[PDB]
Amino acid sequence: MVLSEGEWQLVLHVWAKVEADVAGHGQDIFIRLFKSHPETLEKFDRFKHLKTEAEMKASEDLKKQGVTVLTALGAILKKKGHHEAELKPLAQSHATKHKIPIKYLEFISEAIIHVLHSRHPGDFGADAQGAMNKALELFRKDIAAKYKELGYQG
Ligand code: HEM
DSSP states (O other): OOOOHHHHHHHHHHHHHHTTSHHHHHHHHHHHHHHHOGGGGGGOTTTTTOOSHHHHHHOHHHHHHHHHHHHHHHHHHHTTTOOHHHHHHHHHIIIIISOOOHHHHHHHHHHHHHHHHHHOGGGOSHHHHHHHHHHHHHHHHHHHHHHHHHTOOO
16 A cells, blocks of 8 residues: 555644653553453563553553554654565564564554544544554554564464
8 A cells, every 4th residue: 555645744743743742642552452452461471460550550661661662653654654674673573572463453553543533633533544544554564464474474
């Protein structure tokens, strides 16, 4: 797939708002993911034991992880499709070390879209959401292709 420049613009416009508070958005997204799809929490040996949303909010390690994730994703989105170098180490660790199925990347995509919709309604109307969904589908398609090359296609 290929986004137009006008689609990238909508994506990078709402992303600039996210970057005003990366740690806060990171928290909201992971809590939404773990509440919505509790099976995903099992993949994290560091967080596995967290029982409630209160415990999740209070975890400093969870917050650092959310910042790690959104910083890597932001660097990919700012490439506007030219993200082959960035995807390689990402696909290799998630396929081979962490073992993260594509299905779970769809779950976190859903969480990202939920949280931008809550926090940024004015910059996240229907067209901006369509563009962000396109940018994440592109991300997933290219990651899935890399999984397949790496021997996982999970
Ligand atoms: C927007 C999608 C995602 C991005 C950009 C991303 C990014 C990262 C980055 C940069 C790291 C640290 C370095 C590395 O190990 O590669 C990491 C580690 C990790 N990721 Fe992700 N990730 C994503 C989605 C997921 C999802 C959906 C899961 C599981 C349900 C997952 C599970 C893990 C695990 C288990 C680790 C190791 C954490 C630790 O150090 O204990 N990732 N991820």
